Every structure is written in structure tokens, then in C-alpha cells.
Amino acid sequence: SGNKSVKDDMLKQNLEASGVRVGESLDRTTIADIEKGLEDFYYSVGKYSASVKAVVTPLPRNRVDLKLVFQEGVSAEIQQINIVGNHAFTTDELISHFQLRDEVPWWNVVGDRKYQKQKLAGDLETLRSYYLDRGYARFNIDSTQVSLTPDKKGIYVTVNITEGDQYKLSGVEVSGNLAGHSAEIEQLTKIEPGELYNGTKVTKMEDDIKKLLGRYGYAYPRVQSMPEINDADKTVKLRVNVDAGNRFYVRKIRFEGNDTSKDAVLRREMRQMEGAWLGSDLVDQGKERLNRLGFFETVDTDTQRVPGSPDQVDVVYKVKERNTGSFNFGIGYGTESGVSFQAGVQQDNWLGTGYAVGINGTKNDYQTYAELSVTNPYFTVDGVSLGGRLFYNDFQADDADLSDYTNKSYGTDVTLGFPINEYNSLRAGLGYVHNSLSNMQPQVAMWRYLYSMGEHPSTSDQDNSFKTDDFTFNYGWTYNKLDRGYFPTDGSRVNLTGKVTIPGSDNEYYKVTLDTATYVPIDDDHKWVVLGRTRWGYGDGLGGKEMPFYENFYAGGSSTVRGFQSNTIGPKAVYFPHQASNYDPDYDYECATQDGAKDLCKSDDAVGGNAMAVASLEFITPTPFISDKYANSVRTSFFWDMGTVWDTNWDSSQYSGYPDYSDPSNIRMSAGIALQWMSPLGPLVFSYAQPFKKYDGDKAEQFQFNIGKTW
Amino acid sequence: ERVVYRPDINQGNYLTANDVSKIRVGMTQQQVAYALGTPLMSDPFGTNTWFYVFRQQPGHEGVTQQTLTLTFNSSGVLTNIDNKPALS
Amino acid sequence: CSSDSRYKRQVSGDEAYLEAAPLAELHAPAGMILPVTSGDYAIPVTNGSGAVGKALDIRPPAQPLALVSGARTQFTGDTASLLVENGRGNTLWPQVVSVLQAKNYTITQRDDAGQTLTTDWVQWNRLDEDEQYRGRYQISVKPQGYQQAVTVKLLNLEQAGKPVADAASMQRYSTEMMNVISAGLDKSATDAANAAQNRASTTMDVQSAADDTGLPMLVVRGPFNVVWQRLPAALEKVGMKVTDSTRSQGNMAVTYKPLSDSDWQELGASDPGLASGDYKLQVGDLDNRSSLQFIDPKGHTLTQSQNDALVAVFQAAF
Amino acid sequence: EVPDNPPNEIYATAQQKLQDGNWRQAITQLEALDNRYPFGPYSQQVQLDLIYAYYKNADLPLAQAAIDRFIRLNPTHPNIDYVMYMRGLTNMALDDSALQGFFGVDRSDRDPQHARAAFSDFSKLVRGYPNSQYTTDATKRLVFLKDRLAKYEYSVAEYYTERGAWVAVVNRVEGMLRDYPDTQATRDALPLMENAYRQMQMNAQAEKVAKIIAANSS
């Protein structure tokens, strides 16, 4: 009671360390100890004058209750940070890199002038590094004084230093047991003539030598540099003593925490063989591949020396399993015009077997959409993938008569992927699709496509039909180097997909799509990121035909341009007069009909286009109010999205009065804030976006909620 | 095949010409282990034999193996060296 | 959604482990040996007399309870023994007989001179058991050395009208009878103790003496139970009505209520000036003394001057 | 939330709830009775009942903590074998999945850590108390756990056979022979060791393994 800054959790753990725990005995002699300890903690933070006094009240049956009355004061603030003896640099420049702040600018309201002993020690280390990286090689902190105003709210800091002279590196001399890699080490100890000494460079050189040795199995070498200083001409000669040691071999590779995933699922991602000489680079590659898999929340490695053995180690990968799946589900009608239901099951690691299984569909009175997809990422040991997909979509309008826009489609697809590098992988497959449209409302784009196919449907009556069986060859290429599998903080992923109708199909065309997502971290902790995402698409017919209008690209939504209604960006339909197949009392018929006018009046129904290009720039920031324990389960970002869809075949010569949909200039834009949460039902994305740039017919939708990975 | 990328499958323990030449008959087991390192493969049945196998399979390039069999007596004194430089 | 009475006594899982293939040793061909076994995963050869699978009771064994007294209590195979406070002279036998009659348990043989008796069949009621058991018991009172103890022997058990021989049920029901007798005796003892405590009224004098922590406390010269019971009323008198309390923890909380000067001289020995926030209180246990500690809403402790105002009388309110 | 009725009433309520099978309320009552009266006539019985309720309530970490506390506080309690058996059961329960069990998935390829812990606990119980009433079930569970651990090693050896890592396969099968000689998984793995020896062109070792297989054809 009384503590306003130190949480009860940290206090409670501090209690157990001293033996004070519920159910145990009360060691009275330790009371003073604990009290003093807590006070010391309050003094480390700078909260001098704080008191922590313990009260023991006797409860019956020989029991006690321990109440720790905290009375914290006002935290002291650093009044000054002074460096005495700095003649080469200036106090302002030196302390600008300090964690402790002497003063805070009025604009900066995220930092304070609070004191901490550990921060002071790190600050002294930073100053020492600053002076040693400029070639002084003699910088010494003579003393450090931390003072305090008599009112105990004015802490002061002072550092007395001696810069010494500036030295230059005469040359690095490396000697010892180099294990035959001397030639490759001389290239790591190359120095420019007359270059100034630099401590961080020497440390990096030592680390590079250690890493170079480790790549050949020398897991435990010793590298020490003892620079010999010569003040006669102010030159320092480095002396790197290296002892490679013994070459280590891996005995067993063990996996812990994979309570669901199969053992082979983790082993198949290993570049380090079990009964072979160790390679640290191979172990790191295996860890990175496991991280990129996306099946595990966290992955760690531990190389443990085998007891009683100077040559063998055990590599242990410790993983934390993650919920790899989404369960999108909803009901739209309930009791209006019948009943409806939806399914969204999607698993990336089905029962820990590594299979990717996704089944989703929608059953309505007018729709019977069903889709199944099963892919084995490892159909061969090397990583050859074998996928498959079945889909069946139906549109009947639940009328069983004419003038209903019947559209029944169904198709199959088989894919086969295989790697070519550690990051690149190609894909080839065969797909079949059957599409049967009937009773189509006349429109300029759809009728143009139908004419391109050689059909001549009437422009007035809705009576019409069209059947097409298409066999397509699908190809693809994925380059994946992302840091992680679900919330990347580095690296880029590029996915190219395409299809071409092989001769013999009803309609000839080709289509290609290209995604891209690049994560660039600005913070060393990878907590602030910049995400540049883009998507491109182009399709067209091969012979005298045209790309089918059901393969068109759609933009706008929670996946392409947030802030717009789904599949709303792009060309809008233009309807011809009907003069037949009109329902006067329905009132749902469009402008161009018997009940309405008899011109090509433009509607607001999005039809998509055969060319698409969308980009997006995102800034990933830490969630403002969330415990760091759940930091990786939620992501907050500020996004600016751009997008456009146009129909390259739109004839501007005709329909001059109507908008020209072949112009890619009309670029929609939006900006807003998005939040992604890894809930039990998979990823949930909330986003609020304002579309400050929009064109006629664009239906805006500021708030959007989505289930499952957007992209 | 021949186009699917396959990583290098290194198997066994590293052997070098100098290291193999550093071992001669009459050497004790501890001396052999010091010279060449602890073997990754012995004979679990009734024989005191050490197998130093050196496999490398770069992937679509052929597998090369050098196998050095060291037979000791009951006392642990090296008795026979059998060096096979390449596969048959 | 669907359950059965038997899920209570069985293991959480399945009997799959009972279908595991047996272990067979490997024959070593002539001219060579097999690798020496580590012995880390060697299964000792035991007897397969006990139950396996769902026929095994994982219900915790019934430990005899030393309720009447804190002396030693122990069961061994078929008999339970429980020592009592000192030996109670010859009154232990009549006390046990009276507690036995409390449950109208029938007795056939009597050895009051020798302190031994037998009981006719007794029926038990446990929701755990699908079928209710029953059996006979023998109760005696004998001295184990410097003290007098009660011993019970379970003659036999019967479930579904059939005899039983499993040690689990025998131990369970021997402990059941011993605990029943002991709980009756302890109930009599605690009723007598409660009557004595209620009769022994305690003074309500208050004091401001501090303790090892250095703070003053509204000490009350009485045992914990009575002062704790009377503190809610006293706090109500001063307007600090209790909203949360914990007898086993001592912690309690009050809420502000405005009382004028006339109300404060009526009861509560005047205003300490605590007129803001939710305050908390703690009590102590000292069989003749009892410390009352107050803390401010900010989380601090009241100073001596703050509580000295109430210490004036702070006695009529209790 | 638990009233402060005298100790006997609280214990009776806890026993009634345990008999009724409401694990959560019985657990709450027992926790109240244990943290109110830490050292009383109910201490041992309450701790045992808490262990049992935690096990039946799927609060396995709490059951393990309670078991450790009971073992360390009462190293020579007469009913200590029951606590060891319960620890074995808890560790074996941590090695199970219901969703995978529904679909008939063989989980021998997953983490064997909890299976190893359960084997250690059951072996301790069986060796320490041969005459306990839980010894037969403990032996059966030990046999099952040995088979499962050998199947795990077999899975690893099979994967490395697929990968072409022959030294790893040989070492894994040798470890199986040294650790689980009498399991079926070792018999299945023996041909893998012979194949690994053949691939590395060490024909003498392959012949020895083939002789071993022939002598134990079944």
C-alpha cells in the first residue's frame, strides 16, 4: 500500500528472493533488511526521502499479515551534467549522446530528467567509447561525482576526464594458432595508411575473426588484442593473439516446445546436419528458416558442450508454438429471404503436419460458394511443394426462371513448387475452369468482350447465355527473406503469379500479378518499422479475343486501399437500354431500362479492369498502451494507400461524353490508422481511413473490420 | 531434377592429409583422439574399431567420401590403419 | 455436454497405454555382442496384482483426522489410532459413547469395563460412489503411554451386497468412522469453548500505545474475536461504515460519512479529521490486547495526533 | 468469496463438492481451508485433496507444484507413493492433446520431454515402493512410455535416412540399441542402420547388422 510507481508484481518477486512468501514463516530479523533493500531501490531510481516501513499484525492461530507502507517522495531531477577536462570536444556534443538528460526541449514531451545508476554507468561507457573511437587511445575517466541538493530534488552529475593525445594505427600484427586460415584473417585485419586508432573497429575485427573461425567448426576460440602504445610518435600497434582451439562436431540436434508440430517439420528446415562438424552460420540459417516459417512465436538456439568431451556439442532449438489459423464466420440474412451461413477455416500447420489446409464457403438462397485447398510444403525432401485447389461458385437468384443473371462456375487447380535458391522458389501448375453465364444485363464492357469472343447478343433483351471451358498453365515465383512469419520487422517478400490459356481453351488470354512487401527497421530494437507494400496486375487477350471480364482486377478494401468499399475502385458499368425483361414493380432495375430512360446512362456498379496498380506506405509503431509481454501479439501502424484500376480496352473515341476509364491518372488515395491483433480466431485487423482523394462513384467506408491475414 | 536446390549435406568428421599422417601404429587411443579428434562413429558390437568417415555432398555434384578405419586391441593400442581415399 | 457419475473416480485420459506391445529382448548372434545397455530406461519386474486402467481409484487416500486433539493419529492397514489431549481420565469412554449415540449407531457387544465395543452394520452415503458401501467396526479406548487413545478396526466392507477386499476402501472407511467420531468429539469441545468465550465478557478500554513498527494503534484490551466483532459497530457510530472486511486477514475498509459536532460528542470521542477518501484498518490478536491500525487513502499511516482525537474515549461506541 | 465458517464446516463443504464432482468450487474451498489454517489437523488431507482436484481440473502446473510441496514437506508420509503416482499421471497428461487425439494422430513425433519426465517419475515410484497398489499401472505406463520414446528416436532416424545423413542415422540407431533394446521401434530401426552402413560402403558393419536382424527376424 502507498506505492505509486513500483508495481506490486516487482515488489512481490523481491519478497520471494528474501524468503518472505505466503505460507512460510516470518523471519523478523530480515525485516530491516528487506526495508533497507527497497529503500535502496527507491534511491537508485532517484526517489530520495522515500520510506518503506513494514507493519506486522498478529492474526489468530499464530499467523501474521505483512503490510508494506510505501511513502514515496518527489523524484529528483538532474540539474546539470558537467564534464571537466574536455578540450577537443564540447560538453553539449558529448552529452547529446547520453541517456541521462540535463534538459528537455519544450517540444519533446516523451523524456524527463530522472536519474538511474545503471543509466549513469552505461553513460560513462558511452563517453569512453566516444573518446576511444576518435583515436585517443588514452582517454581516462579520472573520477565521477554524483551530488545532491540539500532538499534532495536537485541531483548533480560531474565527470572528470583526461583526453590524452590522438594516436594512429601503425599496423595490426596477428599471431598465434590460426588453424591454417591465416590468409583469410589478414584480409580482416587490413588498415588504411595513417588511419586513426579506433576501439570499435578493433572490437569489430575481433568479432569478425571469431565468426570466421566459427564458420569452420572452431566454436570456442580466444581472440585478445593488446595494443602497444608509443608516445614518441603517437602511434599504436595492435597485437591480435588468436587461438582457434579444437574443431567441434554436432552430436545431436534437439527440439523443445514443439508440443503440436511434428519433429520432422522442424528438422527439415535445418542446414546443420546432426553427425557433422559444426558451422555457426548453418545453425543461424536454421534458426532464421524456423523463424521465417511462421509456426512459432519465438525461436531460440542453445549450443551446449557435451559433458566430458572436448569436441562435441548439442544444438537445442527452443520454440514457442503459435496459433496458425483463422476461423472467419458470420451470418448475413438470418430470416430475410431464407437462411445463410459462412465458413472460413484456414490452417497453415494442420495438426502440426505442416500441411496448409483452407476450406471456406458461403451458402445462401442464391449462392453456393465452396472452396477447398490442400498443399504439402514438402512433397519431396528438398522442399518440392504439391498443392491443389477445388472451387465451385453458383449464382441462381432463387427464381428458377429467366432474367436472373445466372452464373455457375467451378474449376480445379494443381500446383508444383520447388526452390532454386535459399530464398527463391518457382511454381508451375495446371488449372481448369468452367464458366456459364446467362441472362446478362447489357453493358458496354461486357458486350465488347462478348463481341471480341464472336458472340452477338441482343442489346435490348436480357435473353442470352455463354459457356466457356478454359485450361490454363499457371506459373509463379516467390522471393522470401522476411525476418519473421507473421509480424516481420526486416526483409522483403516478392510474389509473382500468372496464368496463360493453353491452346484448346474457349477463350485465349494471359494474366500476371506481382505483390511486394518490404520492411525496413529504423530502430535498432526493430520496434519502429517502415513497410512499403505494392501490388501490380496486367492481363489481356492473345488473339482477336479479350480477357474475360470475370478475371478483372478489383481494388479498394481492407487489403488494397483502406477507406474504400470492397471492390469499388475502377471502371463503372454503363448499361444499354433494355426495352424488355423489365419488372415495373421491382424498382431495382438500373437507369438503362424500359421503366427508365433509353440512353447509355452510366451507373455506379464497379466492374474492375484489366490493369491494376496499388501502393502503400506504412509506419509501424509500438502500441501506445500495452504490456511488453504482449508486444508481439498486437501491431499498430499509420498507413497511406494509393490505388488505381483502369480498362486499357475502353474506347474513348466512342462514348466520348462518358468518363474515360482507360486513363491511369485517376489515383485514389487514403490515410488513417490500423491495428492488428492476433486473437484466438486468427488475425483481426481494425482500420480507420479517410479517402481524401476519390472520384465519382467511389463508395467510401471509413471503418473496416477484417478476419485473417490481409496480405 | 538437377534444378531443385539442395543444400550441402556434410557428414562425418573433417580429415586432412597432415592429420591422417600424424597417426601411426602403436599409438594409444588417447593419442589418436588428440591427433584426429573424437570419432563420430565406432563399432558398437564386439570390436574396438574407430571409423573416421568424411562425407561431402555439395548437391548435384557427386558424393566424395574418405573413410579411415582404426582397429585397436584390447589394451587400446592402435594395431591397423586402413585408409580408403575415395568411394568404389 | 453429456457426463456420467464414473468420470469422478477415473483418470483424465484413455486406456490406450494398456494396449502397448510387450517388450521382448534381442538375441545376440554368435561371434559378436550387442551394445551394452544404458540401464536408464530399465523397467523393474513387479507383480501385476493391483488394478489397472479405469479400475484403479486415484481418489486420495483417507488420512485419519486429529480433530478432537492435536496428538498423534495414524492408520495401519485395517486399524486407525488417535491420541487425545492428555488422557481425560476415565471420561474418554463415556464421551466417545455419547458421540457414538449422537448418530444413533447400533451397538451389539459392550465392554465398558474393558473399554471395547462392536457396531452393527452401518450405511454410508457418498455421491462419489456409484454403489453405497457398508461394513462393521470395533471401537476401543486404551492407553498408549502417558495418554489415552481411541482405536477403530474395520471388520469388513460390502458394496452391491458383495464382500470387498481392496485396501483402498478399507482405509477410506476406517478413516471415515474415525473422523466421524473425532468430529463429534471436536464439535462438543468447540461448542463448550464457544460457550465459555461468550460467557467471558471482556473490557472495552482503548489505548494509543505503539508497537515495534513505531506507529500508534487504537489498541483495545481484548481478544481478537470480540474486538473484531464490536469494531464494525464502533466504526458505524463514528460514521465510518464498513464495506469490506476479512476476519482471517484482519484488513477492513470504511467509507466517509459526515457527522457534526453534536454527533461526535454523542459517540466516537470526537473528530480525528479524517474527512476524505476510503480508509483501511487492521486488527491484531493478543488474547488480552488488540491493535487497531489506520491508513490514509493515499496509502500512508495516520500520525499520533490524527488518531489521538478518537482515543479520548473510543469506548462507548464499541 | 469463501465464508469464514468454522474449519469443520469448510472441510465438509469441500468434501461434498469433491463428491459431487464440481472441481472448481471444491478447489476454492480447499484453498481457503489451507491458506486460513496452514498447519492443522486438515493439512495433509487438504493437500492431497488439492492435488487430486488440480489433476481432475486440468490445472496440471498447479498439481505439479502441490506435489512438489507435499513431497518436500512430508518426505516420509505413509501415502507418499500415491503422490509419486499422481506426479507421473500429471506428466503423462502434459504429453497429450485432445484435438490431435480426435483425429487419430500418432503423437510419438512430438516433444518427448514430458514423456521422459513421466517415465522418470513412474520408475521412481516402482523402484521405491514395489508393493504399492499403483505399481501395476505404473509398470504398464512405463512400458507404454518406453515404446513411445523409442518411436520418437525411430522417427528421427527415419527422417535422417530420407535426408541422406547416414552418420546421423547410424548414431541414432546405436543410441536406440543402447537405450531401448527391447522395444519394437528398435527392431524396425535395425534395417535403417544396415542401409546407412551400406550407403557409406562399410560392408562389414552392414553384414553384422544383417546378422543381428536375421537372428531376430520376428
Curated annotation (Swiss-Prot), chain A:
Matches recorded under Gene3D superfamilies: membrane protein fhac, membrane protein fhac: a member of the omp85/tpsb transporter family
Effect of substituting G330P: Lethal, wild-type protein levels
Keywords annotated in UniProt: Cell adhesion, Cell outer membrane, Membrane, Repeat, Signal, Transmembrane, Transmembrane beta strand
Classification via Pfam families: Omp85, POTRA
Topological domain ranges for the Extracellular compartment: 335-336, 364-366, 397-405, 437-464, 502-509, 541-609, 647-668, 691-704
GO BP, sorted A to Z: cell adhesion; Gram-negative-bacterium-type cell outer membrane assembly; protein insertion into membrane
Disulfide partners: none
Entry's localization field: Cell outer membrane
Gene inactivation effect: Deletion is lethal. Depletion results in the accumulation of incorrectly assembled outer membrane proteins, including TolC, OmpF, OmpC and OmpA. Decreased expression leads to decreased susceptibility to contact-dependent growth inhibition (CDI), and decreased expression of outer membrane proteins (including in this study LamB) as well as up-regulation of periplasmic protease DegP.
Main location: membrane
Gene Ontology cellular component annotations, sorted alphabetically: Bam protein complex; cell outer membrane; membrane
Outcome of mutating R562A: Slow growth on solid and liquid media, less protein accumulates which is more proteinase sensitive
Family: Belongs to the BamA family.
Protein name from the UniProt record: Outer membrane protein assembly factor BamA
Organism name: Escherichia coli (strain K12)
From Swiss-Prot, chain B:
Keyword Membrane annotated: yes
Any Gene Ontology CC annotation: membrane
TM annotation in the entry: none
Topology relative to the membrane: Lipid-anchor
Highest taxon of source: Bacteria
Disulfide bonds listed in the record: none
UniProt keywords, alphabetically: Cell outer membrane, Lipoprotein, Membrane, Palmitate, Signal
GO biological process: Gram-negative-bacterium-type cell outer membrane assembly; protein insertion into membrane; response to antibiotic
Compartmental location: Cell outer membrane
Keyword hit for Membrane: yes
Gene disruption: observed consequences: Mutants show minor defects in the assembly of outer membrane proteins.
GO MF annotation terms: identical protein binding; protein-macromolecule adaptor activity
Family: Belongs to the BamE family.
Subunit structure comment from the entry: Part of the Bam complex, which is composed of the outer membrane protein BamA, and four lipoproteins BamB, BamC, BamD and BamE. Forms a subcomplex with BamC and BamD. Monomer in the periplasm, but is able to adopt a dimeric conformation in the cytoplasm. The Bam complex has the shape of a hat, with the BamA beta-barrel crown in the outer membrane and the periplasmic brim formed by the BamA POTRA domains and the 4 lipoproteins. The intact Bam complex can have 2 BamE subunits.
Protein name: Outer membrane protein assembly factor BamE
Organism: Escherichia coli (strain K12)
Whole-protein coverage range: 24 to 111 of 113
From Swiss-Prot, chain C:
Membrane topology: Lipid-anchor
Tagged with keyword Lipoprotein: yes
Cited InterPro entries: BamC, BamC_C, NlpB/DapX
Gene Ontology CC terms, in alphabetical order: Bam protein complex; cell surface; membrane
Lipid attachment residues per UniProt (N-palmitoyl cysteine): C1
Any GO MF annotation of the entry: identical protein binding
Lipid-acceptor residues (S-diacylglycerol cysteine): C1
Keywords per UniProt: Cell outer membrane, Lipoprotein, Membrane, Palmitate, Signal
Subcellular location field: Cell outer membrane
GO biological process: Gram-negative-bacterium-type cell outer membrane assembly; protein insertion into membrane
Pfam family, one: Lipoprotein_18
Domain notes: Contains two well-defined domains connected by a flexible linker. The C-terminal domain may serve as an important protein-binding surface for interaction with other Bam components or substrates. In addition, contains a long unstructured N-terminal region, which is required to stabilize the BamCD complex. Only the N-terminus of this protein is observed in the Bam complex in X-ray or EM structures, most of the protein must be highly mobile.
UniProt record similarity statement: Belongs to the BamC family.
Self-association state and partner proteins as the record states: Part of the Bam complex, which is composed of the outer membrane protein BamA, and four lipoproteins BamB, BamC, BamD and BamE. Forms a subcomplex with BamD and BamE. The Bam complex has the shape of a hat, with the BamA beta-barrel crown in the outer membrane and the periplasmic brim formed by the BamA POTRA domains and the 4 lipoproteins.
Name assigned to this protein: Outer membrane protein assembly factor BamC
Species, as recorded: Escherichia coli (strain K12)
Gene: bamC
From Swiss-Prot, chain D:
Transmembrane segments: none
Membrane topology value: Lipid-anchor
InterPro entries noted in UniProt: BamD, BamD-like, TPR-like_helical_dom_sf
PROSITE patterns: PROKAR_LIPOPROTEIN
Pfam families named in the record: YfiO
SUPFAM superfamilies listed in its UniProt record: TPR-like
Top-level taxonomic group: Bacteria
Compartment(s): Cell outer membrane
Keywords: Cell outer membrane, Lipoprotein, Membrane, Palmitate, Signal
Gene Ontology biological-process annotations: Gram-negative-bacterium-type cell outer membrane assembly; protein insertion into membrane
Consequence of gene loss (knockout): Depletion decreases the density of outer membrane proteins, but does not significantly affect transport of lipopolysaccharides to the outer membrane.
GO cellular component terms given for this protein: Bam protein complex; cell outer membrane; membrane
UniProt record similarity statement: Belongs to the BamD family.
Subunit annotation: Part of the Bam complex, which is composed of the outer membrane protein BamA, and four lipoproteins BamB, BamC, BamD and BamE. Forms a subcomplex with BamC and BamE. Interacts directly with BamA. The Bam complex has the shape of a hat, with the BamA beta-barrel crown in the outer membrane and the periplasmic brim formed by the BamA POTRA domains and the 4 lipoproteins.
Function comment: Part of the outer membrane protein assembly complex (Bam), which is involved in assembly and insertion of beta-barrel proteins into the outer membrane. Constitutes, with BamA, the core component of the assembly machinery. Probably involved in transient protein interactions. Efficient substrate folding and insertion into the outer membrane requires all 5 subunits.
